[PDB]
Symmetry: D2
């Protein structure tokens, strides 16, 4: 059933577990993510960037909302990192149950202003909002990360429902040389000041096994590095209630596409290579839920 | 908008042009097909095999019906070679506007029996029915009494089959067959046979296994991933005459799969560092859209919406 | 959320309570019933007769199915008393999650043939079926055989009720012994049709607002309580709903001649139906069962 | 099929006819309106007021939108007289294809600010907006409650609104003015020259005598009911009115039938038996309306 973010994110933080948000751009990804959630009896978030809405169009948005409603477990549909008030309005129009505008690159007053305007429109129609303070970039001394104090003020001036924090993560397959630094003490401090559920983006693990599977097939990838699993577990115990995963899914999906087409030159039936790719995505989603502890939490 | 197609097809034959039916299995194929339809302002049929339904499930069926409705051109959603009564029932349940039961391999009475049962079920819920007589197998120009009663639709039988069953369309067997290997050189199409059947069967006619399997495409596929044999499809001119002769609905599947895969292979082959799905499914979807468009140009449905 | 009748009815009998199946013909009725189920945190069944489907059309079926999915309680959408195989097809086409063809009036064999053919089509698409044997009596042994022959999912038995505002004179008959006997031979959930309470208070209210009603007679509460305990898991409800609705439309229009705003007389009428549904859920014991 | 108001209205004004917008509050009304539009091969607008939003809830909004998409004729779903930005947002949320806010009671600049903000939100979403300037009041003081033409042109230019609702004499209800309601056509004709965008006429029910008396007969009471004369509608359209709203005529027709069936049959309590013919009467009214507006066959 369709629900807002706040719904399940609160029980998540109060219960000491995290709910995974997974990015999707088409049918096979949406199925993999929802079946995984059904089998694991876990709540889940379908994340759709603006890039997704562009590639997906009406086909994607109506289907995600439709499958989300028809699922037996709680499912929210979030627009991730919206870039404008107008983008947010389109997400509200397409039935998203949670939205967010990324103005973390703006000065404080501008971020508060943009965010607050989004909060009023979203709440006006029963939708929840994820605010964003600090910039997603790996590393403190320069204070490019979330200021816990500013975080409480941000949440108070805007009336956002949950907060995305910058403590060391970043999108993509190269989050750092070796194990990326995650500022836990900073996270704990923010958590003491912001009781609202916390959000962790750019959280892919980029597992070595997966990195090698990609190479073994199509190949070509550098010193890829993701967020260490132990850091995910710790960040969640401090208050992270929502964790996004996009890169691991893309990698798993393409690795299977390449090995299937590589091993079967004569093959030209789409489902024969996209189906296995879909399965691999579903498996990734499940270990992800197991990792976050959202299993059996629906 | 969502239509049953009978009206789409009736106007197709009445005006001597064909409407393309295109197989889909996911989002990318559905978008390409429908966009190609919006462009060209052409009516179109979204075809889903039983394999598509299993692969796509509710996600696919729900999406195809929606979108079909939203479209600004006439769109029909057909089952295509339904294997059983229960298969047709699943199609009715998922909102298809036209179903098809394939019992061409069975004797005449069993075909009629099964088909008729489908017509009653479909018509009870405002859905149209396509039925086929004769096996879709290729034939050379050597066989005598073979390319007659043995294989290929027999006109007299056609009229009778269509009358005993309440079918609305009728797929005919005149030399076409599925897959990329339709026959050495230009596969023979029994045009006179099609002509006779049309003279006895007024209902719109349907042509399956009609992919063109263009050489350039074959070579593009080999140039990338590769490995395909002496691909041979139905000649464009045969498609034109057949259409001028009463063929109102033409199914295309192989051409789309090949184009889509050709592009996936080359994009992934050219950019090993790529793992963002849309980077290879996007250009693959675009190649499918272009295939559909040219297909509509060949069918004469451009601007017929 | 939208589910088949079996899913909801199976647990009902296994838990010792009954689920109400309330007939709807339009928006206000569908809302009254769903809002009742939500507040009572109870599973519910929306029943649509062939007349309902005729009157409401695709406007009604689309809506009922949509509201049911979005419901925060388990909801089933039933064709109730289908008169033909084609009628059932339509119900499956419109997204119904449960169907039933009424062939009780036919001979056993005809009933079994007709019903078996419905079970085959519905099951083929994941929809469950209710089968009827008797007149709104039923032999406990005929049921067992009837059920095993036609793989139906739940059975409605003739125990002494009758769909109408006059189910007898003194008190309507409810052969509890006959129920237990069949409940012993049929483990599948049992259904009770024509079990309206046609309350004295409502009859009086209906009359006070103009409008005539004969010696109204319905089923007694205790009989429902006992029938349920014995195995009745689904109780069809309609008459009482129409009465309350009409009772209110009348007095509102009578006490306000200048009133021509539809929501002014249909709204309080919708309210009365919601209240009947709630008390109906209490009686069946489905409150807080979602 | 679902379309915004602007599509059909622009065509209407150029071709010289009007498209009817009919208020609905439940299923029966929505069915009556759409069936009439289908049978008349006419485009139609389904109008929902905030009262409708409250009364029908999500059940009504989702149904109206779905049936609109399904129809074989152009159908727009408009919010009529939204009372706030938040209200307009909800309407965008529920899939409406045209919205409007009514702050015409406020001063010009406040009205412009409020409308422009609504325009930006709707257009960003592919939805069109109807602006309102002036108070809907009957007349026989000058510009105290009427639509100042030159002000309209300025109103439309500053607020990128798609169409304009004018106050040239109409008002809501079944009591529009003693005798024949006065319609300030000249006022309309001037505004029309200053504003090329399609015009809208609210409070335009005819309140026909044979329906009023029909109501009294086997029914309740009603004062000296009076609506806009058919001629005033026929001409207002020739001068640029592309959209005409009807609400009261439908409520009356519907209640009249409800009252007659119940009154003539005290034993009746099957809702479909009294709502059904009520729905048929509203449908006949809608059909006559389309005929009057000149939209038949314009689908």
């Amino acid at each position: 059933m369709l629900v807002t973010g706040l719904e399940i994110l609160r029980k998540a933080r109060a219960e000491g577990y995290g709910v995974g948000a997974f990015n999707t751009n088409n049918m096979e990804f949406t199925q993999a993510i929802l079946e995984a959630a059904e089998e694991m009896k876990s709540p889940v978030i379908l994340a759709l960037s603006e890039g997704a809405m562009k590639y997906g169009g009406r086909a994607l948005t109506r289907m995600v909302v439709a499958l989300a409603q028809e699922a037996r477990v709680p499912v929210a549909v979030h627009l991730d990192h919206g870039s404008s008030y107008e983008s947010v309005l389109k997400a509200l129009r397409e039935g998203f149950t949670s939205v967010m505008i990324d103005k973390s690159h703006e000065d404080f007053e501008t971020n508060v202003r943009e965010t607050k305007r989004v909060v009023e429109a979203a709440h006006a129609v029963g939708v929840t909002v994820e605010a964003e303070l600090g910039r997603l970039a790996g590393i403190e001394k320069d204070a490019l990360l979330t200021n816990p104090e500013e975080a409480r003020i941000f949440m108070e001036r805007t009336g956002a429902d949950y907060l995305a924090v910058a403590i060391g993560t970043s999108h993509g397959a190269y989050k750092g040389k070796g194990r990326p630094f995650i500022d836990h003490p900073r996270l704990a401090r923010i958590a003491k000041l912001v009781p609202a559920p916390l959000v962790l983006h750019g959280a892919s693990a980029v597992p070595q096994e997966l990195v090698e599977r990609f190479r073994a097939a199509g190949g070509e990838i550098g010193e890829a590095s993701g967020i260490h699993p132990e850091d995910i577990k710790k960040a969640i115990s401090l208050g992270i209630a929502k964790i996004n995963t996009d890169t691991d899914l893309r990698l798993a999906f393409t690795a299977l596409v390449r090995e299937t087409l590589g091993k079967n030159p004569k093959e030209f039936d789409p489902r024969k290579y996209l189906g296995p790719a879909r399965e691999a995505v579903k498996e990734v989603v499940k270990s992800r839920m197991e990792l976050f502890g959202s299993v059996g939490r629906a």
